[PDB]
Amino acid sequence: KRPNIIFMMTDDHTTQAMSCYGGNLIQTPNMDRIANEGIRFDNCYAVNALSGPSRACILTGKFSHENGFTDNASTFNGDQQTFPKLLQQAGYQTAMIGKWHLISEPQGFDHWSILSGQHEQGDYYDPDFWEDGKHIVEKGYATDIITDKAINFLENRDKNKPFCMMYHQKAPHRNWMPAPRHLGIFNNTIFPEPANLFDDYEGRGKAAREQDMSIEHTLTNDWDLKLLTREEMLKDTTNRLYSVYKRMPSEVQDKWDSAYAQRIAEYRKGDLKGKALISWKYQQYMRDYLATVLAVDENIGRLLNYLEKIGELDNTIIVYTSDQGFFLGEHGWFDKRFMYEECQRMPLIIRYPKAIKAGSTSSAISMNVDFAPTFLDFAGVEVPSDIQGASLKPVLENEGKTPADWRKAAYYHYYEYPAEHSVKRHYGIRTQDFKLIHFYNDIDEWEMYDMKADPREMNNIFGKAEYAKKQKELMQLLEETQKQYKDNDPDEKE
Numbered sequence: 001k002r003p004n005i006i007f008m009m010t011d012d013h014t015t016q017a018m019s020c021y022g023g024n025l026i027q028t029p030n031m032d033r034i035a036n037e038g039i040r041f042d043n044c045y046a047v048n049a050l051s052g053p054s055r056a057c058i059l060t061g062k063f064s065h066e067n068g069f070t071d072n073a074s075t076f077n078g079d080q081q082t083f084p085k086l087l088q089q090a091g092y093q094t095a096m097i098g099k100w101h102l103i104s105e106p107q108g109f110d111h112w113s114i115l116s117g118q119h120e121q122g123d124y125y126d127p128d129f130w131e132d133g134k135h136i137v138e139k140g141y142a143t144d145i146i147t148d149k150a151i152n153f154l155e156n157r158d159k160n161k162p163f164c165m166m167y168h169q170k171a172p173h174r175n176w177m178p179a180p181r182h183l184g185i186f187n188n189t190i191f192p193e194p195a196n197l198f199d200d201y202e203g204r205g206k207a208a209r210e211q212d213m214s215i216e217h218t219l220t221n222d223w224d225l226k227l228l229t230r231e232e233m234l235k236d237t238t239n240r241l242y243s244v245y246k247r248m249p250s251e252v253q254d255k256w257d258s259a260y261a262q263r264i265a266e267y268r269k270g271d272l273k274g275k276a277l278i279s280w281k282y283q284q285y286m287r288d289y290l291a292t293v294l295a296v297d298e299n300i301g302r303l304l305n306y307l308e309k310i311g312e313l314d315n316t317i318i319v320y321t322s323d324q325g326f327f328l329g330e331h332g333w334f335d336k337r338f339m340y341e342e343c344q345r346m347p348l349i350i351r352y353p354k355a356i357k358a359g360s361t362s363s364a365i366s367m368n369v370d371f372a373p374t375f376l377d378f379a380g381v382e383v384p385s386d387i388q389g390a391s392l393k394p395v396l397e398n399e400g401k402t403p404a405d406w407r408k409a410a411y412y413h414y415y416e417y418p419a420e421h422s423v424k425r426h427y428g429i430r431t432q433d434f435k436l437i438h439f440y441n442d443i444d445e446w447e448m449y450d451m452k453a454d455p456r457e458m459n460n461i462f463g464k465a466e467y468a469k470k471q472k473e474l475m476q477l478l479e480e481t482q483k484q485y486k487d488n489d490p491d492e493k494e
């Protein structure tokens, strides 16, 4: 009678690249099936928009200052409480397959197979895995391999125990190497630009101006844009693009070279400069990012079809999300980290027909700390008091409606600075209609956005007289929220 769980999570996917979220860029039919047969959350947020921290928050139901894992230079204390351990005590068989990114050996999993290359980022081709204590190499393409490993786990499971499987893809993380069948697929496709692709940061503070995550300056010609021929790579085999290209089979290298020849010729013509060059880089980025997404959605389909074939689709809570969202050129950026909406907001779609009316939507403000208590609640396990999120069951079971007692803000705290991409440390709250942010290291600057009037977050209204009352109310809610979640020294002074 207890439901199975499959928790499907990508790395750096985002709502703009999902058709169920009204995106124009790509159709995602299998993700959309989950939404159309289930519920779509419009206001689910990561509490620290970085991979390792998000994964730690998901396992523990706790904010980063409680779970210990504040940045991608942390090691997860595996002795702490996590939902898979609790499910395993309750009689579930548990599995972890794909991107782990928590460094310590997984605990609470009957079976685990985790990407070990690139310091646990994984490789796209011929990925290394650490699997139940041993190193292996899997031939092929990661997005497909991870799905085959998931199916193999399910085929070989103890069919007298319910299962909980965490299925964690590498795609679509940088540097966006598509599957062989998708190489070159968007070479003749032009994607619409966001209206703020050329953002000059008027109306923002120092943090937006001082980042290093731009289309214009940060994307590299080799690793990101793929602008080397085979001949060029073979002359310098220490090249980082070559380090990942060389993992592809010969026939895939041939297809890659054919797929990128046009792009290389366009770059070598030497006529692209300034805004035109930024626009061209944007197209190349989107073509690679979106081509990489295609295999993710195909593989979700394979899992949905497998579950249906074995008669377990309706008896399984099916979740799809991404560790955080991602900038697809908005504000001129790629990457995450900021509390801005594109990357703070996680996709969250859930199918479970017993509980969830098909085609439901929710605006209930939800966080990645809510996943753990939701799974424990549906598994009939008492939710321990130290979990900081809340079960989503009351939302799920009432067509997505927001309970009267539901929280009024999502809380956010990002720590990783100085570091890659140079995003200042900050914390804040997102209410239904507003956002309040404090950047506190190595600047001291507040920002505030009216999300209904300014959904693209272009106009910092902090300190503007007409918002004085609202600003005070948001300050007060921020302080209450910090106290509630025990973030007692949020500026890290003591």
Ligand SMILES: O=S(=O)(O)N[C@@H]1[C@@H](O)[C@H](O)[C@@H](COS(=O)(=O)O)O[C@@H]1O
Residues within 6 Å of the ligand: 011, 012, 050, 051, 052, 072, 173, 174, 175, 223, 335, 336, 420, 421
């Ligand atoms: O040149 S790369 O090495 O590709 N650079 C990427 C960054 O662009 C990315 O922000 C981090 C963290 O990403 S996370 O999703 O793991 O948090 O991972 C790598 O270091």
Ligand SMILES: [Ca+2]
Residues within 6 Å of the ligand: 010, 011, 012, 050, 051, 173, 323, 324
């Ligand atoms: Ca990520």
